[PDB]
């Protein structure tokens, strides 16, 4: 279907404890495939998914350089941002950047992204336009002017429209057997008695990929949304994910409740009940 | 942007010196290059931020410091003839920056013996009457001679104002004995005005040569005047006619 | 690696001039830079081109004819001015060292020749305004196609031709100066080493 490539970057200053820790990771969809950590013994951009491993040494040398460059750009930007905000060199601060592209099943750009955050807060963002900037504050406005002057959006837009899309396509092809295979959740319902009056019904979804999934409880086949507890989808640690959904229901009424599971890997949505 | 100093420097072998460089651009990145014939621009040291310096292609004989982001002083603990060169301080927003601004440059001459340092003598040569008659123009020529090292700035002053129109100065000084790197230099300059401007005894033409030589602290072991940084001028006044009488 | 094949280029004032540059880089990311170094020695940044910029850079009279495929980054200077006469450096930074070093070319000396409207070649003698018997020879008003050879005799000093521009009258003229400590030295021989116009005025 639709697919995405994302690069995430985090620089954390640690004054009095060396220079900024820089960590960047590359995702295709929900699959980590590259990483770089400025704290690794001899830092290289390293593969983290098999299909990327075919890429040649020129690829790895270049990606390593770009990450190093990003690390350095970030060190400078943390310095600069202290001046923009009149902050002390004594405080630890975070620069975050994400960028990448969405492609439709047709493989053409659906949406491109490039966004920065300073200390957990939006700083500057490429608009959906892929052609204009939105600065969150006065400091970021300074950055905006610098970047408008350099015609950054123009070149970023070409990247999001060209390489990003094209390499995403090629990754998708090289990782066909995995990136393009949807693994359905193994599902089951557990029953957890609270008291003589109530029980928890917990609908489980395990070993699925991609992370996107819908778990819902119905009662007599009618919506039970604002009455449902959904935990955050979580990684199993092997590239698949887990989630559960839970309702507290009157004891002896369990049979009115059906769990419903929608997921790319299911030909048709599931209806599950607790095995009473 | 980048204020690099001094523009000129003669150094006795073994002497220290700090080339200064400051930028008022909040630049994180500063660097020093030396420019040498056939060697292109070589990086000496650089600093990606305050408190960080690293060695370039030729760091030896130099040390740098980056106490503040604004300054990147380059230090020559012990001057050597090899270190004779043209040095450029460069700054930019970051390692990957494109605003690459170079300083005015520091032209450094390392001499074995300061006794080779000579200030210019300056002469002004008045316009030929033949030129005046033939062209209705009048060319004055200023000649700065006998100087060493090459560290001069030559300016024309007319009625007390620096003038540029009608002025042409040799691009590079010419050696009085070119094969010796110790030889003294001569520089010429012309200032052309109209005859009728020249034929006014009230018009004042001064040729001014600012020469960069020894400092106050430099040891001086000769009987002749210590050739310190100084200005040397020669002047001329318009030649009114026989005859009166400034022409209208 | 930056290749400027031309140690020097000349151009008629007002005309446009292209200064050649080719660069050698394996990296897909780099920037090309031009700098101007006038007689006084400063390094004036003129223009920058990013390897991913599809537009060719422009800054005033400077344009950079960036041909990624041909690997050339020629500087074009529109409407050459006398003030353009200088050294021009092509330079580049690339990903291999995270854009650290500038790699500069050997540089090209741009010689902008004045359009000489009315040549009037002449060698005048000028006298020191001071109570000296020192003298100077001034070859002046020759066209941009005559050349001044320095002396082959070491005791006679001859400057390269110099263009001055009297702006108020938009008047430009070449000169070369010559002087000697020697005694047989008269202006009538001062520029013998050069091939000077046959009609070069030698006043009496």
């Amino acid at each position: 279907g639709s697919h995405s490539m994302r690069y995430f970057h985090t620089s954390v200053s640690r004054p009095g404890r060396g220079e900024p820790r820089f960590i960047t990771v590359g995702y295709v969809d929900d699959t980590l495939f590259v990483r770089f950590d400025s704290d690794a013994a001899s830092p290289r951009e390293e593969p983290r998914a098999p299909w990327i491993e075919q890429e040649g040494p020129e690829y790895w040398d270049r990606e390593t350089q770009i990450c190093k460059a990003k690390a350095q750009t970030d060190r400078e930007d943390l310095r600069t941002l202290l001046r923009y905000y009149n902050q002390s060199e004594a405080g630890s601060h975070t620069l975050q950047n994400m960028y990448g592209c969405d492609v439709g099943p047709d493989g053409r750009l659906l949406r491109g992204y490039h966004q920065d955050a300073y200390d957990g807060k939006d700083y500057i963002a490429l608009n959906e336009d892929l052609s204009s900037w939105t600065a969150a504050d006065t400091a970021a406005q300074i950055t905006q002017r610098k970047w408008e002057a350099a015609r950054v959006a123009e070149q970023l837009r070409a990247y999001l429209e060209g390489e990003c899309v094209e390499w995403l396509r090629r990754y998708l092809e090289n990782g066909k057997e995995t990136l393009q295979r949807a693994d359905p959740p193994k599902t089951h319902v557990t029953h957890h008695p609270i008291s003589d009056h109530e029980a928890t019904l917990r609908c489980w979804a395990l070993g699925f990929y991609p992370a996107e999934i819908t778990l819902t409880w119905q009662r007599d086949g009618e919506d039970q949304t604002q009455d449902t507890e959904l935990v955050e989808t979580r990684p199993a640690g092997d590239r698949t994910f887990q989630k559960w959904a839970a309702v507290v229901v009157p004891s002896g009424e369990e049979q009115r409740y059906t769990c419903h599971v929608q997921h790319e890997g299911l030909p048709k949505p599931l209806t599950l009940r607790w095995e009473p | 942007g980048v204020t690099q100093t001094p523009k000129f420097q003669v150094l006795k072998t073994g002497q220290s010196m700090t080339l200064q460089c400051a930028q008022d651009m909040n630049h994180e990145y500063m660097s020093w290059y030396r420019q040498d014939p056939g060697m292109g621009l070589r990086l000496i040291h650089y600093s990606v931020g305050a408190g960080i310096t690293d060695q370039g292609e030729v760091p030896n004989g130099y040390n740098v410091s980056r106490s503040t982001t604004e300054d990147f002083p380059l230090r020559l603990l012990s001057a050597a003839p090899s270190q004779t060169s043209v040095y450029f301080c460069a700054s930019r927003e970051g390692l990957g920056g494109t605003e690459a601004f170079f300083g005015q440059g520091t032209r450094l001459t390392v001499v074995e013996d300061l006794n080779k340092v000579f200030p210019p003598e300056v002469a002004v040569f008045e316009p030929s009457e033949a030129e005046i008659s033939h062209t209705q123009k009048a060319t004055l020529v200023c000649l700065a001679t006998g100087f060493y090292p090459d560290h001069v700035e030559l300016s024309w002053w007319v009625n007390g104002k620096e003038v540029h129109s009608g002025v042409c100065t040799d691009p590079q000084p010419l050696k009085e004995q070119p094969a010796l790197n110790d030889s003294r230099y001569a520089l010429s300059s012309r200032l052309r005005v109209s005859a009728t401007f020249w034929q006014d005894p009230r018009n004042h033409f001064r040729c001014q040569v600012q020469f960069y030589g020894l400092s106050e602290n430099d040891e001086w072991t000769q009987d002749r005047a210590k050739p310190v940084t100084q200005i040397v001028s020669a002047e001329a006044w318009g030649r009114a006619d026989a005859s009166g009488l400034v022409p209208r | 690696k930056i290749t400027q094949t031309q140690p020097g280029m000349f151009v008629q004032e007002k005309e446009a001039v292209t200064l050649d540059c080719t660069y050698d880089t394996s990296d897909q990311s780099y920037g090309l830079f031009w700098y101007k170094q006038p007689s006084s020695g400063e390094m004036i940044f003129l223009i920058y081109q990013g390897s991913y910029d599809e537009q060719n850079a422009t800054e005033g009279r400077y344009s950079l004819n960036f041909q990624k495929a041909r690997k050339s980054a020629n500087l074009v200077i529109s409407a050459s001015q006398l003030g353009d006469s200088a050294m021009y450096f092509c330079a580049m930074r690339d990903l291999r060292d995270n854009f650290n070093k500038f790699y500069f070319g050997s540089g090209t000396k741009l010689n902008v020749k004045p359009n000489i409207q009315n040549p009037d070649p002449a060698v005048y003698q000028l006298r020191d305004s001071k109570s000296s018997d020192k003298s100077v020879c001034l070859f002046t008003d020759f066209d941009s196609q005559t050349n001044v050879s320095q002396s082959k005799d070491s005791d006679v000093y001859i400057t390269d031709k110099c263009v001055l521009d009297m702006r108020s009258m938009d008047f430009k003229s070449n000169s070369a100066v010559a002087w000697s400590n020697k005694s047989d030295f008269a202006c009538a021989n001062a520029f013998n080493n050069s091939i000077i116009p046959e009609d070069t005025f030698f006043p009496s």
């Binding site: 930007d77 970023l156 390499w167 | 994180e28 990957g96 | 990013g50 991913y52 930074r93």
Partner: peptide, 10 residues
């Protein structure tokens, strides 16, 4: 495949 250009400083 990562993006990069010169001059992206904030």
């Amino acid at each position: 495949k990562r993006w990069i250009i010169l001059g992206l400083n904030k």
